[PDB]
Amino acid sequence: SYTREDIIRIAEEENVRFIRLQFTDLLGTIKNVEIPVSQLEKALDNKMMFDGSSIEGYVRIEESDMYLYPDLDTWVVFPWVTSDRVARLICDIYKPDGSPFAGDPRGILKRVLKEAEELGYTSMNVGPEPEFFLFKTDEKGDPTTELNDQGGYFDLAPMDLGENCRREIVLKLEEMGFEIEASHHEVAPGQHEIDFKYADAVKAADQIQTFKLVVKTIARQHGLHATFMPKPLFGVNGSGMHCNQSLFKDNENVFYDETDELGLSQTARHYMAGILKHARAMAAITNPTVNSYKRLVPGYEAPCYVAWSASNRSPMIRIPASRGLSTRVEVRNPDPAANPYLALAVMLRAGLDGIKRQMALPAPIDRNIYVMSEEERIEEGIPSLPADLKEALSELIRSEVISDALGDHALAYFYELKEIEWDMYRTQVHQWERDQYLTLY
Amino acid sequence: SYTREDIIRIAEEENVRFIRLQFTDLLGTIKNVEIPVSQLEKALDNKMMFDGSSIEGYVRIEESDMYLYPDLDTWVVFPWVTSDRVARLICDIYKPDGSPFAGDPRGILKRVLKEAEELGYTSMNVGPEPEFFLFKTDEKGDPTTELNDQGGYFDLAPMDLGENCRREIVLKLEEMGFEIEASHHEVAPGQHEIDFKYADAVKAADQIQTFKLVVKTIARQHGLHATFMPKPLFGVNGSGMHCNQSLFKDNENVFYDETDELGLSQTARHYMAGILKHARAMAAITNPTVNSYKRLVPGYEAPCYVAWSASNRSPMIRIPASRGLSTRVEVRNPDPAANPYLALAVMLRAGLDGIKRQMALPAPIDRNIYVMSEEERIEEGIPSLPADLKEALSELIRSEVISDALGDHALAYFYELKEIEWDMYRTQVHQWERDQYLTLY
Amino acid sequence: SYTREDIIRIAEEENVRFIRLQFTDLLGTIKNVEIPVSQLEKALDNKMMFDGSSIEGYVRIEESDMYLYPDLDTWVVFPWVTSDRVARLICDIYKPDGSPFAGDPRGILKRVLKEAEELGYTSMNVGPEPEFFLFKTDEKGDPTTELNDQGGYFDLAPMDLGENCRREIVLKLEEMGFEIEASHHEVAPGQHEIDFKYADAVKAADQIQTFKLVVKTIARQHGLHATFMPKPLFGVNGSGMHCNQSLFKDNENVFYDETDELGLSQTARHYMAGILKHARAMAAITNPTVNSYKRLVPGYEAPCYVAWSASNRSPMIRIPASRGLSTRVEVRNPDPAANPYLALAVMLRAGLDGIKRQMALPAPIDRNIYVMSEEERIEEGIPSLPADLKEALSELIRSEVISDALGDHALAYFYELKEIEWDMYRTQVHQWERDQYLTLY
Amino acid sequence: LIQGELSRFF
Amino acid sequence: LIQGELSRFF
Amino acid sequence: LIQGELSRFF
Amino acid sequence: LIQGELSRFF
Amino acid sequence: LIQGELSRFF
Ligand SMILES: NC(=O)CC[C@H](N)C(=O)O
Ligand SMILES: NC(=O)CC[C@H](N)C(=O)O
Ligand SMILES: NC(=O)CC[C@H](N)C(=O)O
Ligand SMILES: [Mg+2]
Ligand SMILES: [Mg+2]
Ligand SMILES: [Mg+2]
Ligand SMILES: [Mg+2]
Ligand SMILES: [Mg+2]
Ligand SMILES: [Mg+2]
């Protein structure tokens, strides 16, 4: 941990000249206010004002005034600063009256965690699995369409291809304070994955943001381009951000039950049922972009139907074989483009809603591949995820459970942002249309 | 502070070889007289004569003789001089008889501050928010039309886009003696903002001039071009110089009133009413160029109507949420192309005139966006800012309050300069006309 | 003249394959409906329907249905058609109920001529003086900035500079049925003027439209570009369309009065007074574009003040020395970009309004050049023409006399078109601004 | 309004 | 209503 | 079921 | 005022 | 009259 005096001590010792007061907007982009070290005490006194309307993105209408409340435990010094050391602090957004801002994603996650604690659950242990692609750049420094390598699942090419920009990223993250579990080459060419050790929800989301920033910076250093686009290329695997979750009550995993056949407590089953019922409503948050639904197509391990299994091609919810204190519920819908705070908040709220109502878990899907017809699917009661952003937005609007998780202020602005994005997307004439038509017609 | 002996001591110690006796003309351009260190005592004795007619710009008709009276508190040594150290002093212009020159903008601001002190207000605390654009240069060293980056509001770019040059500017300013509050990326690409801590009006204007000079020099060092042009590009946000003002009487903020519903004293309300009443007359000074009125167009957060609010799209006057000793009135008309001394002088004079006549504050504008018709606007008594430089000049001439603030000598020369500029602009045939016409007709 | 049987006879004899049913929109652009010769009888029966909303330009809101009523006297066969002969007919726009469309400029001129005939004036004899520029084209066929020659006033360069595309245009117009008076070189390099003999107002406007089309076509044939843009270049003379008018009552010139000192009847003086009174209101019609007011600047013989004289630099109204049946009133405001029908209609309506109310003619301006101050100008009661399109539009709206000449339907659409054009123009950032600023600021 | 705000799509 | 009509300025 | 894995032949 | 007339020298 | 100073526009 850290204290004010500790922060000042390292800042003087490390010769830190500039401090980034980092926060996140509704779209998951990392925003910051640069600060000279002479303002560190003022920042630590929670007295820095900024617009605050920058959270709304490009749909902001009026300028507000909000305070930055830095979190002392998030202090870190970037290793690449070299000459002039630059540090960062992750801050919460507070209204001038003293109450937290309702539109801050971090505050939303904190509020959902608080109402979880109100039910006796001390913490939510989250381990994400973000995947990314590496692209070669051109002379101008822009990404091309060529992958950095052509490796496969768990491939090993020590020279410049298999690891490439994965060893140095892990080394820098380790120096930065990360707990890295393992790294490997992903299924698609040029795709890599780095796993962290499990942490609490807020820490996990902060680590996801920092990891994305660090990966992008290090890839840029090596003349490469790192992207967390859900589906950068057609015909190859997309990138997912599978989230492993387990509820804890005083160092006790409430998902574990040795007496159960699958080692799953009734609490875990209610959690899974709640996540399953609200999946279509959550899709607009866990899959927020237009490109997110190009990944949710059959044949690339991405989930396309709302179901759970212990072993299947692509279930919405998967249960890893680990038991005991490591029994987990893995949700595979999210892509790395999702906002970590909002995604974790909506998943936790759906699970808590399932727990509260003693919801009944549907039967798991067996090795029955979904080659079955739609009549078989809705006969067996297997729902499907939304086919595009428009359906997800409509389900989001109609939902009363996870809209409460978002809150009244953030829901309207998120809906406006996504509606504008979809409207701009739907009126474009793509090259595919000019290839199919313009000669035939 | 500094004294004559102190200045001589640092000049000998720092090996200063050249001294710039800096002053400002009516157009805000920084002018100087270069001096060898052997003439420092003569300069400090207020004995240096120069033309003085250079204040009038290109409309000067006859050469005069005027003395430079350096301000010892403005002494600073430039950091980039390296080999031969160069220092600067900001000087006031005095007639040979001993009286200050009536056409000196710094003297104008000093006179307005003196007549403010005559009402019991010891100081006027000013915090400006100047914004600037960064453009890439060509081989010859001329600015191209391409921005240095493509970031957004409060965007994070640790590589060399948003920061890098910005960090270097902040570092240089800290050495100079600038108390930097915070720096951040602005809405438009290549647009950046650096904020200083609040200071007295004369010091604030001196800091604005020095800041512009330093930013331009540092940007040139990195092969970039920095501009404070109000609207360098069509379709993107312009650059403003929002000025935060508060009147002080013996380190007591007279704008504060805890008993008031908004925490605003009657003095502050009278000040704001006075500023609103004379806004159209001040527009020619706070928005002095032709390009200034291309910024004052709807849809880019620049004010277009004379009104005040605590939360709106783009009010003329905005009142930040801070209270206590930091209660402020923010005027958002000025652009960085304005003369800081003249702009602060006219704003303070308008506020004092409102205080003296005890003008009634008009009702604030609510979230009612100005999509309302012109009939609705003039039914509610909402005036609009001048549409171009000609209207502003006519209002300036017709005004008897802020023309007195300018004084008889400076008003005539400013009017001549702006009339010549507008006449040159209005007879040009632009490429837009040749694009619309020359084929259709 | 011509009849239906005559038209069919020439169409069969001349092997005409295609017929253009020509009309004009509110902006003066020539629009047409192409017709195969097999539909000539249907066209001559006044049975062809078209949109009719195309008159409104780009501000049309809904599609209508309107009939084309060809004018048989306007029949002509283009000479350059060669292989497949193409003919044209100028048509009036009629509503399906049978009444003429109120928004048709030709119908507007016809209605004003009818209300003139109601006062006993059988015809209005009009002779225009349209001037145009010739520009050299590039390989792609686009106009460059280089003039075709460098001649002067009434210069003579037989080889390729003096006449060039002026002899051929006159020859083609003569073969087409025009009555050409003379042609000569104008003020600026590449500027030429061709004058026709006087005709009735409707015929004069039809001839102006046909002349513009023919000049453009012939210039394109010789690899040149012909433009009627009022001020294509800065610093050189613009192009005007001085209109000579005289009212006739049974082949008697009512403007003539041998007993008068100037040979001017009281009717002519009332006409000129009426034109002078409403000049600022008519400016938006006779000078319709933004570029029109770059021509109305001093020093290039374009009128800038509302006054009349028999000999002056640039009077608004000039009276030629010819007397008898050729006594005329020359109005020099219009540029060739103006709509001929609308311009003639508003000028005639203003003159008739002056006649009806018996307005008193102001004193003519002597050789007193307008170097006099603005105080001298408004002391003598000399009004000035609007400085830009916005002022002209405001005067147009405020006017009740010539707005009646336009009518209710056409006025609203013309105002919308010009408001959109001005709004598009005023928000542009021109290269002149980037040259003055972006370095100094 | 938000004209310059929507420049990311343009 | 008029978007494709205003393309002459764009 | 398998498409992105068979990309080695494509 | 002769401005466009004196263009031969300019 | 004061033309040597107006060269900035020229
Ligand atoms: N876990 C894997 O084998 C890869 C998962 C796949 N990239 C997805 O988007 O879900
Ligand atoms: N987001 C903002 O408030 C920026 C203001 C804008 N740049 C202006 O010129 O006023
Ligand atoms: N001197 C002349 O007759 C030319 C007239 C001038 N070209 C104009 O536009 O008015
Ligand atoms: Mg994986
Ligand atoms: Mg997984
Ligand atoms: Mg700003
Ligand atoms: Mg501001
Ligand atoms: Mg002529
Ligand atoms: Mg003439």
Numbering used by the authors:
A (entry chain V), B (entry chain N), C (entry chain F): 2 to 442
D (entry chain M), E (entry chain Q), F (entry chain R), G (entry chain E), H (entry chain a): 2 to 11
Reported in the publication:
To ascertain if this is a conserved mechanism among FBI-GS-GlnR complexes and to elucidate, in detail, the molecular mechanism by which low G + C Gram-positive FBI-GS proteins bind GlnR, we utilized single-particle cryo-electron microscopy (cryo-EM) and solved high-resolution structures of the Bs (1.96 Å), Lm (2.61 Å), Pp (2.07-2.28 Å), and Sa (2.15 Å) FBI-GS-GlnR C-tail complexes. Notably, the Bs and Lm GS proteins in the complexes were all tetradecameric, while the Pp GS in the complex formed 10% tetradecamers and 90% dodecamers and the GS in the Sa FBI-GS-GlnR structure was all dodecameric. Despite the differences in the GS oligomeric states among these complexes, the GS subunits in each adopted essentially the same conformation (superimpositions result in root mean square deviations (rmsds) of 0.5–0.7 Å for alignment of 400 corresponding Cα atoms). C Density for GlnR peptide and contacts with GS in the Pp FBI-GS(14)-GlnR complex (map contoured at 0.06 σ). These GlnR C-tails all form a distorted helix and bind within the GS active sites. In the FBI-GS-GlnR structures, each GS pore binds two closely juxtaposed but non-interacting GlnR C-tails as each pore contains two active sites, one from each ring. The GlnR arginine of this motif makes contact with residues on α15´´ and stacks with the side chain of the aromatic residue in the GS D50´ loop in the Pp, Sa, and Bs structures. Using electron microscopy, we show here that some Gram-positive bacterial GS enzymes can exist in a tetradecameric state and that this state is favored by binding to the master transcription regulator of nitrogen metabolism, GlnR.
In Gram-positive bacteria, nitrogen homeostasis is controlled by an operon encoding glutamine synthetase (GS), a dodecameric machine that assimilates ammonium into glutamine, and the GlnR repressor. GlnR detects nitrogen excess indirectly by binding glutamine-feedback-inhibited-GS (FBI-GS), which activates its transcription-repression function.
